[PDB]
Nucleic acid binder design. Structure first.
Ligand SMILES: [Mg+2]
Ligand SMILES: [Mg+2]
Ligand SMILES: [Mg+2]
Ligand SMILES: [Mg+2]
Ligand SMILES: [Mg+2]
Ligand SMILES: [Mg+2]
Ligand SMILES: [Mg+2]
Ligand SMILES: [Mg+2]
Ligand SMILES: [Mg+2]
Ligand SMILES: [Mg+2]
Ligand SMILES: [Mg+2]
Ligand SMILES: [Mg+2]
Ligand SMILES: [Mg+2]
Ligand SMILES: [Mg+2]
Ligand SMILES: [Mg+2]
Lengths: 41, 176, 111, 97, 26, 109, 189, 46
RNA sequence: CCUCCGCAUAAGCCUGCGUCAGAUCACACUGACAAUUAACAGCCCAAUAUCUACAAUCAACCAACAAGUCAUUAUUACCCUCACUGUCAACCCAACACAGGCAUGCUCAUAAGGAAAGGUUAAAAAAAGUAAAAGGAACUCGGCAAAUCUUACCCC
RNA sequence: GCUACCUAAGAACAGCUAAGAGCACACCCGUCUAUGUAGCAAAAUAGUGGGAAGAUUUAUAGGUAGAGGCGACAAACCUA
RNA sequence: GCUAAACCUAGCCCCAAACCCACUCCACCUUACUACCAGCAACCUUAGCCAAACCAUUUACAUAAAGUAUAGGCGAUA
């Protein structure tokens, strides 16, 4: 593959650091987190 | 008697028995020809002796007394094989004028690939033998498309490998 | 001899003789408690009973009274790392019955 | 997780190579070699596209014609589909028509 | 294996930010 | 029903198991009651020489001299057969009338 | 043995390599040649780099597939041999293999590391010759039989009369066996 | 009724239908054998 | 206590609970070794002409119709002599150690062959079974089911 | 190699009453109900049933193939 | 702290040049992988999906002249 995304880890932790005080699976799982950290902001 | 399949009872399982230097091929071009037959049956009693030893090694789940000793009595058999054909290939070239004793032909089979047909000792000439006439030795041009495609693939195997050996001639040469 | 084109015989044909015997036998210990006067061999796949008759009386001067053989099937349930079956070889087993009352028992090698 | 742990081996790009230090030499062998040759007769590559830019459909009509007789057997049949697909796509699909 | 180097370099600044928290310095 | 296993003589029905056999190189023929005729000329009678009083043994000693490879070519045989062919200064023209053919081979081994 | 075998320290048909190179493994291949190869099995050499440099020893093994010498008693480390149960066993030093070019051949009566060419000499014909001095370094390096062995004197009898009579006849007349029956022409096709 | 056993095996029918001699009996069965030679199959017939 | 099973052959499968040992519902899996021996059964036929109208059914009466499952001779040719192969298993076809599918011969109830219950408690609901006062189709679309063995008629 | 039909030469059909007859096993099929519905089973199990010396049942080899085959037509069946 | 994560090199691709392959022994067109017995033998228009908004004629299998002359339900298009 030319041009894979090598730093995908760091777009995930930009989101999850504002979701780390949540409860459930939203403090770990990014698919559920971005629906809630967006609603938190 | 049946004792000729075993070694002598003074070396029934010492775990080391000395025996050395199988027959190299110039030690038999040395020898004559009455006594190459006469030495084949020397070597054959002794090889039949050793196959029934190692079949008693595996039976009792014990190692062989000397596994170094079979391949000498087989490589000399191969040499004694090789030394007589070279004599038989010598005069058959000399007398009749052609090597490869068994007659053959450069023939094309039904799949269209050219091979070495070998000949099969019949009693009626081929025109009247019912079984041999059923063998199609020819082309039938629906084949010539698949002849090209199987040709077409070996050139994909050959160019895959030679190109690959350049890139170990490359990445060796950069480090060293 | 094995792996060789045999000549034909038609009616006034000369006797087939084989100098330089190509096939070799080993002499095995039987498993299921033979009688006396029966020695069991491991003939190669291509060999006959009239061949092992003249094998032992010719090469070994041994007085065989009857040869009886069976074809043994080697196991084909064995797989490597890649699950393709590895055939242990099918081989022949002969049962020479010696004449002249000579009571052959398989000697105990390896004390 | 997908990201590698230790740093990769550092790359040694020999900047003053043979290929790299003399890149682009003998370009302009036209304008100051008085027009004997052409810079399009310096390009080394596939014979169909030697000094010809082309488009994806044009890159296949030219390959099928310039070398198309001498191509490999089931590689030619692949290319005749590809022309038939890119003709069907360029002349019947898209916006902006 | 991805061809990146800046992904792997900037990751071990986040392994040293995570190592000086758990095993802190004197 | 497997294709990968070798088709041996064990596998088919009654009419299949008894035709094939192993490579046994049979002897005679079959006569009208399935009664066999063992031809005594199609069986290889073995020709073992008299090994009694024999010097050459299944191994050579280690103190033997080593040699170089020199294969036995058809010239090398002829040079040691033309030394009795210059006092003019043993051949077979055709191999039909000989019991052991050399080209369309007759014998065994 | 499989292709891209790793020719490690233990022999390639051993009990130990089958623990280590079972027929399904493919590790990364190692890179390596040049059949003018100047280390043999038994020379005296030295060590240019590593633990215990300048140190001089014999060699016990040459592994050509990885360009190895195993210098005798040297470049060693310590392993426990046997050990067979929950006790120690005996510590025994083992030689780690030293790569070609971290090993240099020495001159015999000066005892210094020297670089080796091959100089083709009139006495015949190929031999190793040092570069800094002359001093042609050599190649370095009681039986009696049992009852199933011929002799030295009788493997060299040269019994062969070179007559053209195709062994099958040459015992057919030497055994007296007569065949009045003639073979008759079969269609060989 | 029940329905898995639509393969009731025999060898007299396996070789007389998909065997080598039946494949080489037609022109179209040679190109069956030629396709399994080209593709690289270890089994060409029954 | 079951035996609605069995023992062989055919077909199929192709070493698949034999010996020794190793491991990690439970202890047929893995490695080494060993076996199934021909009389049974396959594998047959020297030509050239030429012969063969009367079934089988205990084949005898008697009766047929659909009209039948088995034979030679003449002359020429002919002295080699028992090979080759199948022979195992708790087995096949159904993805499975699958209540299914599977030709034939005897055993027509067993001389073979197997275990419906891992242990407890004895709730509901659900499955099968057995028993029932008085009534006896009042049930229901319909005596469906079960129980008794049964009447007559219509349409097609 | 299932299934529709056909061909070659096979095989089976107890016991009782007396014939494309009746009762009735082996066998073949599948009427009705109950269970089952990721089942034991990609159509089975337990009863209960229709036929069971014939237009039957069935093993073995062969035959017909897709614009077709075959069909006591259900537009069925031709490898779930 | 379990499960796991991590990894470089097998190899491959696209071109360039050069036209490429065949024979240890035995066996292999019968039921291939079978030692050995009295019969005929191949040479042919592609079609259709799809585009024409249906479909029925029709619808592509070095540069430059040139998308020109022409063809075309004179239309898609060639
Ligand atoms: Mg059995
Ligand atoms: Mg199923
Ligand atoms: Mg019992
Ligand atoms: Mg329980
Ligand atoms: Mg009541
Ligand atoms: Mg009511
Ligand atoms: Mg009512
Ligand atoms: Mg009513
Ligand atoms: Mg009812
Ligand atoms: Mg019907
Ligand atoms: Mg009736
Ligand atoms: Mg009835
Ligand atoms: Mg139609
Ligand atoms: Mg209708
Ligand atoms: Mg359209």
């Amino acid at each position: 593959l030319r041009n894979r995304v090598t730093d995908r880890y760091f777009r995930i932790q930009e989101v999850l650091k504002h979701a780390r005080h949540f409860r459930g699976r939203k403090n770990r799982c990014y698919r559920l987190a971005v629906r809630t950290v967006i609603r938190a902001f | 008697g049946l004792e000729e399949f075993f070694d002598d009872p003074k070396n029934w399982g010492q775990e080391k028995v000395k025996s050395g230097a199988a027959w190299t091929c110039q030690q038999l071009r040395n020898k004559s020809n009455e006594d190459l037959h006469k030495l084949w049956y020397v070597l054959l009693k002794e090889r039949n002796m050793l196959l029934t030893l190692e079949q008693e090694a595996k039976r009792q789940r014990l190692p062989m007394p000397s596994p170094e000793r079979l391949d000498k009595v087989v490589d000399s058999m191969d040499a004694l094989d090789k030394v007589v054909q070279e004599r038989e290939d010598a005069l058959r070239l000399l007398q009749t004028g052609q090597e490869r004793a068994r007659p053959g032909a450069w023939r094309r089979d039904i799949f269209g690939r050219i091979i070495w047909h070998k000949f099969k000792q019949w009693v009626i000439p081929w025109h009247l033998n019912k079984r041999y006439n059923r063998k199609r030795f020819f082309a039938l041009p629906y084949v010539d498309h698949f002849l090209r495609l199987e040709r077409e693939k070996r050139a994909r195997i050959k160019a895959r490998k030679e190109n690959l050996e350049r890139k170990k001639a490359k990445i060796l040469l950069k480090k060293f | 001899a094995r792996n060789v084109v045999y000549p034909l015989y038609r009616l006034g044909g000369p006797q087939l003789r084989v100098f330089r015997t190509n096939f070799f036998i080993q002499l095995v210990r039987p498993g299921v408690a033979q009688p006396e006067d029966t020695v069991q061999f491991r003939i190669p796949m291509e060999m006959t009973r009239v061949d092992l008759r003249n094998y032992l009386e010719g090469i070994y001067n041994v007085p065989v009274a009857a040869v009886r053989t069976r074809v043994q099937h080697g196991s084909n349930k064995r797989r490597d790392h890649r699950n393709v079956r590895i055939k242990k070889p099918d081989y022949k087993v002969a049962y020479v019955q010696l004449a002249h009352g000579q009571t052959f028992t398989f000697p105990d090698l390896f004390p | 997780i997908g990201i590698r742990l230790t740093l990769p081996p550092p790359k040694v790009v020999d900047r003053w190579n043979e290929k790299r230090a003399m890149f682009g030499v003998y370009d302009n062998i036209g304008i100051l070699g008085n027009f004997e040759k052409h810079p399009k007769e310096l390009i080394r590559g596939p014979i169909w596209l030697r000094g010809w830019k082309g488009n994806e459909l044009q890159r296949c009509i030219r390959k099928r014609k310039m070398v198309g007789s001498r191509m490999f057997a089931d590689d030619l049949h692949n290319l005749n589909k590809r022309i038939r697909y890119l003709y069907k796509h360029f002349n019947r699909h898209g916006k902006f028509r | 294996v991805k061809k990146g180097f800046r992904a792997a370099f900037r990751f071990q600044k986040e392994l040293e930010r995570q190592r000086l928290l758990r095993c802190p310095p004197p | 029903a497997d294709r990968m296993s070798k088709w041996t003589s064990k596998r088919g029905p009654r009419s299949f198991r008894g035709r094939k056999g192993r490579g046994a190189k049979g002897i005679g023929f079959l006569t009208s009651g399935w009664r066999f005729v063992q031809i005594k000329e199609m069986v290889p009678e073995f020709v073992v020489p008299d090994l009694t009083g024999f010097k050459l043994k299944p191994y050579v000693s280690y103190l033997a001299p080593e040699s170089e490879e020199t294969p036995l070519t058809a010239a090398q045989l002829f040079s040691e057969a033309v030394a009795p062919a210059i006092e003019k200064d043993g051949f077979e023209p055709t191999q039909e009338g000989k019991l052991f053919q050399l080209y369309p081979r007759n014998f065994l081994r | 043995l499989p292709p891209h075998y790793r020719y490690g320290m233990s022999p390639p048909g051993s009990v130990a390599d089958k623990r280590k190179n079972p027929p399904w493994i493919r590790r990364r291949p190692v890179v390596v040649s040049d059949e003018d190869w100047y280390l043999f099995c038994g020379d005296t050499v030295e060590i240019l780099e590593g633990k215990d440099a300048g140190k001089q020893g014999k060699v016990v093994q040459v592994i050509r597939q990885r360009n190895w010498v195993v210098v005798g008693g040297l470049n060693t480390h310590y392993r426990y041999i046997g050990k067979t149960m929950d006790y120690r066993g005996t510590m025994i030093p083992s030689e780690a293999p030293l790569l070609h070019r971290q090993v240099k051949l020495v001159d015999p009566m000066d005892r210094k590391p020297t670089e080796i060419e091959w100089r083709f000499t009139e006495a015949g014909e190929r031999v190793r010759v040092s570069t800094r001095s002359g001093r042609i370094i050599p190649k370095p390096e009681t039986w009696i039989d049992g009852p199933k062995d011929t002799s030295v004197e009788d493997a060299l009898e040269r019994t062969y009369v070179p007559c053209l009579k195709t062994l099958q006849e040459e015992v057919m007349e030497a055994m007296g066996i007569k065949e009045t029956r003639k073979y008759k022409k079969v269609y060989w096709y | 009724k029940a329905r898995g056993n639509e393969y009731q095996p025999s060898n007299i029918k396996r070789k007389n239908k998909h065997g080598w001699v039946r494949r080489l009996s037609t022109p179209a069965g040679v190109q069956v054998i030629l396709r399994r030679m080209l593709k690289g199959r270890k089994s060409l017939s029954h």
